[PDB]
Design a protein around this ligand. Structure first.
Ligand code: NA
Length: 244
């Protein structure tokens, strides 16, 4: 269940090893098109995994993930736990970080629309890359509440979204000593994970064909309609599928 990443001495390779270990920490039913399909039901003792992240200043947070969908439920810093204001995280708080002296319910839920409203900033204007992840860890470790929502969006994209997509893992891991604003291609992948996952599952009993087309933006900023499992996003990008 545990997976660790250290920012001190991080490389593109060490980030890749971390994201592979995160994918490998999640139990799978089987593969569809060589993509792991996550479990629909687990023993409670197996339902949540912890990611330990340590920044350049040697400050560690532990992040709780739901292994059936890679959603971040909350995090711990020292003797405080912090959970999203959402029923899924209230359930998680029964299993993880129970020994923390103080449990905080964050003001907001974990979805990007509420995170962006809380931050007063959209993902397209928040730098990613390994240095951005280092700053995000600092903010969360101290719970600097005015920067926490932005930090959580860095943290989620650098963990949950990188685990879901090779293209995101690759783009974030390439920025070792710099930052970058995420392209519409990265945003589009995050926004469409749920819909694409559903259509890949449908496709497997439907001769490879989607029931419902999915619109993405590609790396040239073009709108593309996805209708089958031969799309590059299905053959050479997406890395995990949730069960409905
Ligand atoms: Na803010």
């Amino acid at each position: 269940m545990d997976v660790s990443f250290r920012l001190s001495g991080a490389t593109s390779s060490s980030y890749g090893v971390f994201i592979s270990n995160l994918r490998k920490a999640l139990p799978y039913e089987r593969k569809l098109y060589d993509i792991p399909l996550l479990r629909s039901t687990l023993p409670g003792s197996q339902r949540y995994a912890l990611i330990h992240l340590t920044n350049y200043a040697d400050e560690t947070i532990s992040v709780a993930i739901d292994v059936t969908n890679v959603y971040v439920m909350g995090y711990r810093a020292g003797d405080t736990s912090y959970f999203f204001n959402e029923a899924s995280a209230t359930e998680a708080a029964k299993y993880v970080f129970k020994d923390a002296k103080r449990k905080v319910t964050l003001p907001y839920s974990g979805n990007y629309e509420r995170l962006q409203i809380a931050a007063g900033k959209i993902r397209e204007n928040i730098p990613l890359g390994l240095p951005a992840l280092d700053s995000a860890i600092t903010t969360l470790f101290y719970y600097n509440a005015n920067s926490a929502a932005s930090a959580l969006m860095v943290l989620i994209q650098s963990t949950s979204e990188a685990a879901r997509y090779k293209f995101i893992e690759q783009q974030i891991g390439k920025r070792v000593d710099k930052t970058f604003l995420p392209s519409l291609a990265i945003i589009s992948l995050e926004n469409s994970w749920s819909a694409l996952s559903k259509q890949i599952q449908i496709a497997s009993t439907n001769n490879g064909q989607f029931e419902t087309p999915v619109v993405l933006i590609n790396a040239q900023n073009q709108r593309v309609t996805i209708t089958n499992v031969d799309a590059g996003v299905v053959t050479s990008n997406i890395a995990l599928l949730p069960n409905r």
